[PDB]
Amino acid sequence: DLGYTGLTDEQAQELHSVYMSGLWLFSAVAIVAHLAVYIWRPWF
Amino acid sequence: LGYTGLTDEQAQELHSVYMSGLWLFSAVAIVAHLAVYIWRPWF
Amino acid sequence: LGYTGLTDEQAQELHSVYMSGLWLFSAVAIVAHLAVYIWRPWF
Amino acid sequence: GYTGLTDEQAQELHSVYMSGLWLFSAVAIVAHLAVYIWRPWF
Amino acid sequence: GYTGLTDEQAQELHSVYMSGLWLFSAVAIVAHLAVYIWRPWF
Amino acid sequence: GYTGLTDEQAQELHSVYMSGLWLFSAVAIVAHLAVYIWRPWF
Amino acid sequence: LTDEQAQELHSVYMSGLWLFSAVAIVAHLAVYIWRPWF
Amino acid sequence: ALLSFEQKYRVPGGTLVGGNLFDFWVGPFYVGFFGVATFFFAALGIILIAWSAVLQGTWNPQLISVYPPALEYGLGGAPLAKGGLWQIITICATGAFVSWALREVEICRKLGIGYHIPFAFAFAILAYLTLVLFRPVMMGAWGYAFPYGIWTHLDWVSNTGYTYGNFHYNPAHMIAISFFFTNALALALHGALVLSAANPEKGKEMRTPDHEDTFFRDLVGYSIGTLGIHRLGLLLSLSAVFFSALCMIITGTIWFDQWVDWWQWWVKLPWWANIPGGING
Amino acid sequence: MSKFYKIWMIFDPRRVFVAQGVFLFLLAVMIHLILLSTPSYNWLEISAAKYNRV
Amino acid sequence: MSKFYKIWMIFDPRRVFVAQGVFLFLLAVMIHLILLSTPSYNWLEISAAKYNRV
Amino acid sequence: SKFYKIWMIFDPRRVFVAQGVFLFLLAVMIHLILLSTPSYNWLEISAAKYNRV
Amino acid sequence: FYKIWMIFDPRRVFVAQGVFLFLLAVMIHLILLSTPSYNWLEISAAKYNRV
Amino acid sequence: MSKFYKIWMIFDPRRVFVAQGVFLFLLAVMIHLILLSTPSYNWLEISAAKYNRV
Amino acid sequence: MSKFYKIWMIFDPRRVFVAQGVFLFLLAVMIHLILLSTPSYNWLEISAAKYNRV
Amino acid sequence: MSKFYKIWMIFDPRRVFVAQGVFLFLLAVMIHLILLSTPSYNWLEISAAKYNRV
Amino acid sequence: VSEFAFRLMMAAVIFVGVGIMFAFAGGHWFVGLVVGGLVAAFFAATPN
Amino acid sequence: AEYQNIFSQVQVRGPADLGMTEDVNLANRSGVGPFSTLLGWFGNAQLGPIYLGSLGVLSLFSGLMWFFTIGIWFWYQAGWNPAVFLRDLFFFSLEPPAPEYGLSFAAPLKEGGLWLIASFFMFVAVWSWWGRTYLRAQALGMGKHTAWAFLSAIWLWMVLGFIRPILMGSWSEAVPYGIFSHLDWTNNFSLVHGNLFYNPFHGLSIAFLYGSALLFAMHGATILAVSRFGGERELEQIADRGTAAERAALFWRWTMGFNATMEGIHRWAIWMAVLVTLTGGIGILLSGTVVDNWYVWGQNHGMAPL
């Protein structure tokens, strides 16, 4: 078979695209937060 | 052999993707370790 | 001896790959032990 | 017997087990010799 | 009459067991002689 | 008999068990004599 | 249990008891000779 | 009331004492020889506790305490104001408990069921008698028993425990605590499993004992069974109470010191007695 | 790699998303708790010391 | 060596990936906690002493 | 004689297992008691004789 | 006294007799070892000046 | 020695690999922790004393 | 003497071998520990005193 | 003598091998730990004293 | 008396006797307790 | 005499039951283990099969690492001496950091760091097992009574190890990992906060533990007493009430004036059991944070003489 979960290749690729959009959003916000904290009070 | 029902091509493709993930993880880990050793060597 | 439904040639193949992994692990461990011994001998 | 193994199967299995046992014992003998030369216990 | 072993099977099994017992006893006797030469307990 | 054994089986069991008992007693007597000459307790 | 079986068992048990007591009396006498208790 | 199925079960017989003299029901309750005895003993005990409260000078339920005789009285009678009321109330309590057990035996006989419930109640009665009768008699004074107060019997527990240092180190106490904890855990698991089988996800059919066995085999790899769990519960509770009675009957009678010092026998075993290192080296 | 998208053909999306949500929530709470437990990075105490509020 | 891919012949990918993720996460947390325990590698304390903080 | 009738009442397996356990326990007990008394503690006698301690 | 074997099971009678007789013998021997008067090892030690 | 391969006809490869991995990881962690508890082989304390850190 | 093999007609080989192996190991451990406890036969301390290793 | 190969006719190879591996590992670990706890054979402490590492 | 019950009383008596004898032999009550407990447990586990 | 149905007279063995499928991933279910006659005298003889999933793997590895950390600390505390390890096994302890470290993670490995590592391992193991108890019931279509009853014990566990130490501002308030040392911690907790007897929620927890023993002795005895009518088949008695359920109800109605059902008795059971740790967690959380001396508190609240 092509997989265990029962998702078409196209379904999986679309879901991965949306997942990576969400991941990049979260990571951009986290990067900005870390930059702000490091400027305010560096830990190195 | 075979227990999980994967063909030769399927196993090769899965191994290729897993190896790519392992290499990215290891590259990030090597960069982090080099940075820490420059910051504070542990030897 | 057929305890696990595994053919003789499949056993040979699986042992070959398992021992390849074992020798990679052992070579890495030997290099690590050599580095530690040069750094701080324990004898 | 109980295991149902054939006679030649027992021959081969014991041959391989004995080969492994002899390898283990040879490594143990070398290790004991090295320790005794380094720091004897008698 | 419980294990169902025949006369020949029982004799063979006891012969192998005796071979093992003599080997074990010989090793133990050699070890005891070594210890006695090292530190006799009599 | 309650154990279900025949007369001949009981006779043979007693014969061999008695032989083993005699062997054990012989070894024990030899050991006791050795200890007695070594250190008598009487 | 049969009467004959009971009689034979009593016979063999009494024989064993007599042998036991024959050993025990000799042991007790030897100990008394070695060290009397009174 | 009567349950819808009660009427066919209310039949004469099954009475140890009294015959048909007391063979009747008051409301839902079954009265017998031992029911009448239970009522008398319980009423006398409660009324005497109220009178002890009058003598003590408090009406606060949490401050009322009936104290046993002083140690000076030994095992003899004491004035009712000092410890005599406690002795009478203890006799009344023992009578009430034993009559309750015998009334349960009569009800079991009438219903044609086993006597497991009176037998299990006898264990609690025996623990109570250990605390009020056997241990004080062995020790020689009624004053070693506990008072009948909501918070003063806790004072007795604390004082008796700290007479021997930390009481955690009593070994039969450890076993009894393990049994109590395991019993509470098993009760939770059994109630949860039966309820989860009988009350599935909404809209689903009732689950079978097969599903219960499957669920704990999936969880822990073993299922004791529908009979096994109830046997296990009976034995866990009875073992906890038995070992409690044992740890209290050995305390102050064959052990008089700090229970922490008892464990030095294992530490001072000859082969590892003197090896340096660790905690005790 | 350019072919990670097939991880969704192996694992159930619901389980993966729930696992990530729980892991991220607990990781964030753990890091914030460590920072609060560190006197040099407790921002409430830093502001109290900076603005002279106690 | 150039034949490893056949792990995926005998081992279910989901089980292997879950076990590997569990192991990696636990090991990483353990190493970070050990580093925080050592005074010479607690980066929060190091920066507190470097910048004269509480 | 006629003691063989003992193999009419007891199972020979149980008889042999019980007798072996009995003999081993008795031998261990006697050896340990001998080690308990300094008179027949051969290790301690050897230590005293050869001035090993 | 032959009715015992039709009243009491021979297996149990023999087992109980053996157990109790062996226990009695070992208790008697240990009582003798406890008392220094008849402790034969101690007697030999005193006689030969072993200790 | 050239015939050990038939051990795979006796033992399940999955069981063997799982148990071997768990055992090897636990042994490695034990050795590393023993070395850490050894004053002369705690590399973190060795580097702290070497570089005058703590 | 020439009929002991019939023990195997009454005792199962598996149970006999397991029991004998366990008994032999336990007896050997007991004797080794007894020798280790006595200071005159403890080979480790004997060598330590012989070679002045402490 | 050379008829020991029948031992596998009576005993299952799987159980024998698993038990032997467990026993050998446990015995080796116990011997190693006894040597480590012995001050005269603690090789880490011996090396530390030899090389003046404390 | 059932066979299991007879085995139980015999196990108790054996436990007591072996415990006494091995407490004397080993020089401590714990050695005797261990030996007697193991022997009695083995005896009680094998009835007819 | 009379068979009391406590130990089986006859054991019967058949093919091992592989369990219900329902919506369970059968690939994550192992094979059946051996059959235990010793266990079969009391309950079921069959061992296994067990389910091992993602949460199962996580829980096993986390708990194994927790045990490993504690055990290797014990082995270090013994000096790697096996004899000392056996002598002092109940005296070893992995202690929390000292109070001067507060809630920080800067405590050394031998002075609190290793305890923090082990506590993280235990945290992950226990919460993974809770998720496992939920999901195993979900796979079979069962209600989640086991998960929410386990949450009651998790509440007390969290209060003892996590919540109360955080509210008190130090990890030293937490329980050490040891046999005798956690008993010492319990005693010192009672001594430091006055008298824990005078904690009302300690009293409620004791009441519910006593009532658990009470109720489950009563229930086991009742089911064994009506097992001659097939009373141990409680699900079938709920679905189709028989004379076992009726006799069990009527015994208690005639004894104490009220009874239960074959279903509602298990509601009584689950609630009596969960209330132990439910009240215990509240009682521990109020110690030191709200009340520092429970005897004086009881004096001010009419529980002790003034």
Ligand code: BCL
């Ligand atoms: C001097 C000693 C003190 C005292 C101080 C304490 C302290 C301190 C506490 C108690 C608490 C309790 N005390 Mg108190 N207690 C005293 C005297 C008593 C007396 C008595 C007759 O004297 C009684 C009967 C009790 C009884 C009790 C219980 C009612 C209650 C424990 C509930 C429980 O089951 O926790 C056991 C259950 C848990 C701890 C939760 C377990 C859940 C977790 C998730 C388990 C995970 C398992 C783990 C992963 C290991 C896995 C291993 C493998 C599976 C094998 N106390 C006195 C005055 N007591 C506790 C309480 O809550 O009351 C307020 C409590 O904290």
Ligand SMILES: CC[C@H]1c2cc3[nH]c4c(c3C)C(=O)[C@H](C(=O)OC)c4c3nc(cc4[nH]c(cc(n2)[C@@H]1C)c(C(C)=O)c4C)[C@@H](C)[C@@H]3CCC(=O)OC/C=C(\C)CCC[C@H](C)CCC[C@H](C)CCCC(C)C
């Ligand atoms: C042995 C296992 C556990 C157990 C079992 C058990 N208990 C039982 C039963 C069983 C099987 C019953 O069948 C029986 C019953 O019917 O329960 C509903 C019972 C019972 N167990 C009860 C209570 C109870 N069980 C306890 C414990 C336990 N019971 C064990 C842990 C406790 C604890 C630990 O404190 C208590 C309080 C009752 C609900 C009931 C018995 C009712 C009874 O005896 O009725 C007749 C008597 C009266 C109505 C009251 C008489 C009052 C006295 C005359 C005066 C007061 C005396 C008292 C000593 C004062 C106490 C003062 C302070 C200490 C508070």
Ligand SMILES: CC[C@H]1c2cc3[nH]c4c(c3C)C(=O)[C@H](C(=O)OC)c4c3nc(cc4[nH]c(cc(n2)[C@@H]1C)c(C(C)=O)c4C)[C@@H](C)[C@@H]3CCC(=O)OC/C=C(\C)CCC[C@H](C)CCC[C@H](C)CCCC(C)C
């Ligand atoms: C309502 C309150 C009561 C309660 C309830 C309760 N407890 C519960 C539950 C419930 C409802 C569960 O559902 C849950 C459960 O699973 O029960 C069976 C549980 C549970 N309560 C437990 C314990 C417990 N409960 C206690 C108390 C109580 N539990 C209260 C009295 C206590 C006490 C009194 O101290 C304890 C110790 C567990 C048995 C279980 C939760 C188990 C758990 O989370 O395990 C995690 C694992 C670890 C941290 C340790 C693992 C150690 C191993 C060595 C790991 C390695 C294994 C290895 C890999 C095996 C390899 C094998 C091969 C080599 C062959």
Ligand SMILES: CC(C)=CCC/C(C)=C/C=C/C(C)=C/C=C/C(C)=C/C=C/C=C(C)/C=C/C=C(\C)CC/C=C(\C)CCC=C(C)C
């Ligand atoms: C089916 C076919 C054809 C083939 C299958 C393939 C197979 C089988 C492959 C397996 C090959 C291998 C690796 C085999 C390995 C075998 C090995 C390591 C055997 C090792 C044996 C070692 C033995 C006895 C050691 C025994 C030691 C003993 C008592 C020691 C006792 C010590 C005591 C009593 C301690 C005394 C001291 C103190 C207390 C301080």
Ligand SMILES: CC(C)=CCC/C(C)=C/C=C/C(C)=C/C=C/C(C)=C/C=C\C=C(C)\C=C\C=C(/C)CC/C=C(\C)CCC=C(C)C
């Ligand atoms: C032979 C070999 C190899 C091994 C032997 C292994 C041995 C001997 C093991 C002995 C184990 C023993 C004794 C264990 C005894 C344990 C006992 C009593 C525990 C009692 C109570 C424990 C409690 C409340 C713990 C609660 C903890 C909780 C809520 C959570 C804590 C979470 C924290 C603190 C996370 C902190 C970390 C981060 C945020 C990253």
Ligand SMILES: CCCCCCCCCCCCO[C@@H]1O[C@H](CO)[C@@H](O[C@H]2O[C@H](CO)[C@@H](O)[C@H](O)[C@H]2O)[C@H](O)[C@H]1O
């Ligand atoms: C089954 C229950 C446990 C087994 C039964 C134990 C009952 C009590 C022991 C009865 C037999 C006497 O056991 C003996 O007691 C003494 C008491 O100091 C101890 O013996 C110790 O002191 C005696 C002198 O008093 C010395 O001769 C002996 O070398 C020494 O080991 C040991 O305990 C044991 O040698």
Ligand SMILES: CCCCCCCCCCCC[N+](C)(C)[O-]
């Ligand atoms: C059917 C096998 C399922 C798991 C397979 C995972 C690959 C082998 C993992 C070995 C290491 C185990 N561990 C816990 C140390 O990670």
Ligand SMILES: [Fe+3]
């Ligand atoms: Fe039930």
